[PDB]
Amino acid sequence: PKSMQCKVILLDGSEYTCDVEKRSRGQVLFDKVCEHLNLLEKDYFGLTYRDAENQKNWLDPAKEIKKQVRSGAWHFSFNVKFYPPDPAQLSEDITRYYLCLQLRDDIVSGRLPCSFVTLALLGSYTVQSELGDYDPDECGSDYISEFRFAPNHTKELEDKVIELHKSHRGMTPAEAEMHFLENAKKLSMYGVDLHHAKDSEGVEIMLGVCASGLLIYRDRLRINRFAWPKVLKISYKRNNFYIKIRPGEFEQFESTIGFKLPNHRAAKRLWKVCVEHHTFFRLL
Ligand SMILES: CC1(C)CN(c2ncccc2F)C[C@@H]1O
Incomplete structure (x- = not known):
């Protein structure tokens, strides 16, 4: 039973590799990726692939993978397909986490435009979730985070992230991710x-x-x-x-x-x- 190697770019930027039988439907691959991610609320998500001109198409989970990627490589991305209008109503924190990762790329890519203050507020909640409470030891007056926050980083934006991060002391990762989502869900795009x-x-x-x-x-x-x-x-x-x-x-x-x-x-x-x-x- 002949199997094709699949490479999936995950929302953290890492690559998941697996094999499926070459006549597999898209759902087979998607189920394997969602199990890798411990994702139960799968309905909001899907896989994309770049076509014979680097345009993004949704992989149809009901159709053969081979009849979609056709002549192209079996290379995919894991993405949000349906953005929940009220993320607080999702059943699991891990669902909200993946939605945060997608939105962070939507923002850095410029697909989701965002004021200075909202860029810094969203960035502050991400830092709080990932690093926990503000530590002055990991930040002098010249601090620049590894975190990508925006399509165009400025020292002013880095400073405002730190100022807001100081205000979130005691905030847990699920709590910070929910605040991220409460702000992001309101953006016009x-x-x-x-x-x-x-x-x-x-x-x-x-x-x-x-x-x-x-x-x-x-x-x-x-x-x-x-x-x-x-x-x-x-x-x-x-x-x-x-x-x-x-x-x-x-x-x-x-x-x-x-x-x-x-x-x-x-x-x-x-x-x-x-x-x-x-x-x-x-x-x-
Ligand atoms: C600033 C927008 C919200 C509008 N827009 C448009 N782009 C080309 C032709 C016409 C448009 F309206 C880009 C973006 O979505």
Whole structure:
């Protein structure tokens, strides 16, 4: 029974290696990674892989791995797929811990924009969880942490992390991680998956997929929002993605809204993540 070597980048930046039978479904690999991580609340998470042009796709746990990675290497990342709108309602601390690791990379990568003060507050809770109580011995007036906190580190930001870290004396790691999450969950781009597109007039927009629905960011005009319960059908055709905005009160007809994506694969990818979010965030 022939087995393929899998390499998975974990949210701590380390590499997990395992083997699965070459005809394995994505769930087989995901179960092995989640067991390695002691993760029970697995529904929020998934595996990604970089495609024949370094774009990230979700590995579908119900489909053969080989029919997804196709000609590419069996190399994956472990990631949050569905960002819980209220992380305090997760059953296990270790789930919150992995969500913190994902958010820390969302912040350093700049996918999750963050004010100076929130960068320093989030950083202060991470230091508290990892190192425990502030120690002056591990920090002179010239201290720079090993912790990556932000897309662009400054001495001012390092100083503000230390100032806030001093305020958290006696805080336990689960407690610090919950405070991290209480702040992060409020950020306007928390759990927003952004996709480049054009409106029906060729004007560049971003479409954001998240728990609360689909976001249109036209930038120069406004930000339109479609709560999932106002969305009846999602579809793609060629390079186009369409959303049927259910007819409101006393309106005769449903309404359909169309977008142009970079290529057909980018339309299919946006359709699949919307369908998955619609399903997941209907069951809350
Ligand atoms: C500053 C934003 C929130 C908006 N945005 C846009 N990018 C290109 C075209 C149009 C846009 F709206 C990037 C980011 O998501």
